[PDB]
Design a protein around this ligand. Structure first.
Ligand code: NA
Ligand code: NA
Ligand code: NA
Ligand code: NA
Ligand code: NA
Ligand code: NA
Ligand code: ZN
Ligand code: ZN
Ligand code: ZN
Ligand code: ZN
Ligand code: ZN
Ligand code: ZN
Lengths: 232, 232, 232, 232, 232, 232
């Protein structure tokens, strides 16, 4: 029974959006699981097998309990019954309290396409008559949040990651093939100082909240607050 | 040093919007102060002196520490330097961590006009060179929230008031002149089952959050969450 | 030639959203038809054959002229040419002046997925070269409205159902398997005082309009008003 | 007791926004009153005394029952207690069922400033303890609508003016000083084919509604529909 | 290497939305290419072979360099991997600096469905490991804009077409089967003075910008301005 | 006749929002004028006379033609006829093609209050019968833009300041009293690494546009584009 299951379309998605928060939860001794929907086979730099090892190292840096690999097609995350059913299996295995996924307002259509699949799977996961591949039992996720990969939007709320900013940067630097030019690298939006741009965003969200660094999140579900109203 | 200072234009505003939350905070042994900007001299039912006693009884039912009465004019809450300065004095006296005020989307223009004054006063309160009537020192409010009086909008978040719904209803029933027809009452939107309409709204916000009753709030300032992300 | 064709994903959708309005139109001697897109085979409580009989009784209580059953899959309302074509047949059979369907902002993705299919079918229905299963002639729907099932949003307009609130509640209570716990019932959002929550919403929309109860609707198409501008 | 009281900042405002609708209501034997808040003393073309006669002729063309002239300052429609009180007098004299005023999204700030004053006056008009200049009794307006002068926005609804488009154009052509260049005219946005631009807008709103010409309106208050839902 | 590739679902889409702009760019000696995604086989008036000749003549009037015909199904522009791949081929052939496509807020669902396909294809076109039908090389489009067919919305910006309004009207009048009733014509929204409605819209957008005629556009991508900030 | 007149509430406002753009325009040999509405007498750090000298040095670093000082009260920018008239004088003196002012979505209410005054003054400036203090002639501003001081919002467009980022940072560092702690400094939001936060924002807007640094702007007026559509 995971506290947190974080979905990305591609390994590095979850780290860019919420690596600071993952590291924060692990230090609170929460069980955090990461699921990549695809093997990122169409990424311009690296290979599928190199990418899997970079992703395994990023998960170890943050202290994620397990890294789950689905094999939905890169640039093929079209709404389908079969794609939803595979994701329902992952939710019903992990039984998470909270699911995180990418925010759909993003230059990469896979990020929005992934969110649409995960939303369908969250609902289907809670229906006992809906049968998944492994015929597992219904599970109702309590909290559903959206993190930002490429976007800089005004978030619904932020989480202070002032104490895990270095761990986030280490988890991103594990993806050498994506962010660090090599002899055989091609220029992408990721090879042009991308990690410093993510730091800049987390710095601006920090400012709105009066801390050094924060990650932004959206919720479609109603937020219910208690301790965080007065924060005392 | 109050935990909470809740502003209304008229006594009964704070009770309608957040009486459940006030009662909840008092039971957590928070210091809660209420300030009415006007004496509600233009209210169709009752009188200024009757209204003050109803308001004092409503505050006792919820356990509010003190009830502060300003004398800005009913239906005269026009943006003015003098009106802002009087409100700055109240903020600098109470030194609250959190300020609540009415949400501006409301059929009663005084609710929006009150919010505009309180927003100006929150900013001016934190400027040491800004001199108030009693020449008090700068105070920076940490949290600023908006409660709903007449509106039913989708809120930024809710607070569970399942355990203080009865105390809220008692604080509202203290305003007999406003909600209960008498021999000499005139028909207003308030004399036509208004308390049951407030209960209905708190019931629907409860449903979105999976509890019996909740009050809705807005924040213009960025929300920073911690314990309430996973709620464990 | 129906005055009204109301689509739901599942039987009970149309009753929750607009049962009061259906009853109102029938009493005005309008011809009202209801179409359920699925047999609701994945509903946690009841069975397909029990659900069909509950739905037939709900239609009789409101006085709907006919209840049409399609067999699109529950939790399988993916955008497809074949699903649109089956719905085009229903529109071209009933030749309705006004079509109602669910509002897409709803925790149940089937409600939004149903609306997307019905919107495509409304457009295709009016193209004579578009051939449906029964090769029927083009029909142009005049009015297209959206009703709310799970949501409480600010609607584009409301309809007074003060005189049909009891008929609505009777049509909902016909779905015993959905709303009334039994020995063999599982807990769902519907088995936990759901009908009283629908009444609460219709009560709050009533208040905005100055009546006891009203149902809320959206229109994407431009509203053209005449008698209702002054209502005299 | 007027059916309709239409406020403008300047004479010609009401005609540009809703001259077609005024003519339509008069033909339905509704009592329509027009109030100009200012004498338009800062208009670049014409004079105050010429403008009053053009306005009187425009009112006769549409068949408005009476034309009421206030003397609030042109480009001086700042929120003030005194300006609101003068407008409350006009509402309490006319006792209108419906009030129309300019939509605030308009290049001319007086249009938005007028709407803000009229909104305050509508609320104060319904409070019996609020005393106006002539100490008249409380009146509650039922319907409150906003018409467009300079803007082309997506309206909440439209009214078919196909049968009163010529009467509207005649009422606008009565303002010769505003729309028709003379020897002593200066170039303004109004002297450069403005009437044909208003016709173009009413033609596009017609198209959305499937008629020749329509005027667009907004409502902040909830719309309650009945006959206009099916329009039969 | 085209300066401009303009996508429509149906021939006449690009002309309605941006015929004035196409004519303007051609006169600036830009290379402009037009791609129709479908043969418009379900259009109520005309035939596929007549429509192709009307489209070829419209392209000659505007001076478009080439007109590209895909054969995706009319009313069958469902999101699919195969439909995206065919559009990727067109982008990789033309290597355009700027892509235009329909704005999704439109009574015709094909316009929105076309935009969704073209957006996916723009992203996939720039991925070298994504293989199209003709295995062409990656191309990154710089500018992506949306034009309006049936809608009248507030655009992100306009382009002055005062000097190409007549060329636009000629390109539209080449579609005789669509806009001009014949002995064998059926009534559609297009056969009822549609070209004059497009002129009216371009006239109103002109007014906002202080010119005779302008076409409106949206951009999801950030606009970067330079010369057009001061326009000197 | 200025190309650009940039209004701030306080000296440093224009530099924070658009110092890069000011420096860019001056290098294009545009005439740029800056007007501060107040002397910033309530600023927590420094004095009025020190602030004026810092402001004069910031203007020299950017190469602004003249720096105009009004004496409206700090935290007293209430809508008034007298405040508007003083600003009309500045517009009619400078006869600018483009006016810049603060965006109203900002934690400092003076920024929004300044924008409201400048908007009223832009309109009144173009009315010849509106008499300013120095009875100057009507001037119609062509372009009106809004820059961001404290906010990080999604802008309508950006301007590349990659080549003037160092000049902007120098103009900000001229305000030593505001940004650099001294023996007698008090902690404010400005004394806590504020210049690096402005650089971070300009870096993120750069990324959206594919350059190193950009400043974001809003326009209420319609944007008309020409060269910047294709940027060739
Ligand atoms: Na939410
Ligand atoms: Na917020
Ligand atoms: Na609509
Ligand atoms: Na409304
Ligand atoms: Na954009
Ligand atoms: Na604009
Ligand atoms: Zn990704
Ligand atoms: Zn009140
Ligand atoms: Zn349903
Ligand atoms: Zn006017
Ligand atoms: Zn088309
Ligand atoms: Zn400032």
């Amino acid at each position: 029974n995971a506290d947190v299951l974080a979905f990305g379309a591609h390994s590095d998605d979850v780290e860019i959006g919420m690596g600071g928060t993952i590291a924060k939860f692990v230090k609170q001794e929460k069980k955090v699981m990461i699921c990549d929907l695809t093997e990122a086979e169409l990424s311009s730099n690296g290979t599928v097998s190199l990418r899997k090892e970079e992703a395994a190292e990023a998960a170890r840096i943050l202290g994620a309990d397990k890294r789950i690999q689905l094999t939905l097609p890169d640039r093929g995350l079209i709404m389908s019954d079969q794609a939803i059913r595979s994701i329902v299996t992952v939710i019903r295995i992990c039984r998470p309290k909270a699911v995180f996924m990418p925010y759909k307002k993003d230059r990469h259509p896979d990020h929005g396409n992934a969110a649409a699949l995960v939303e369908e799977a969250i609902f289907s996961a809670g229906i006992h008559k809906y049968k998944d591949e492994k015929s597992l039992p219904a599970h109702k996720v309590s909290k559903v949040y959206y993190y930002m990969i490429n976007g800089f939007h005004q978030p619904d709320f932020v989480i202070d990651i002032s104490d895990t900013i270095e761990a986030k940067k280490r988890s991103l630097n594990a993806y050498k093939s994506q962010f660090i030019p090599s002899k055989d690298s091609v220029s992408t939006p990721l090879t042009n100082g991308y990690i410093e741009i993510v730091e800049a965003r987390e710095k601006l969200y920090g400012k709105e909240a009066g801390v050094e660094y924060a990650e932004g999140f959206f919720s479609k579900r109603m937020l219910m607050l208690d301790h965080d109203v007065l924060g005392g």
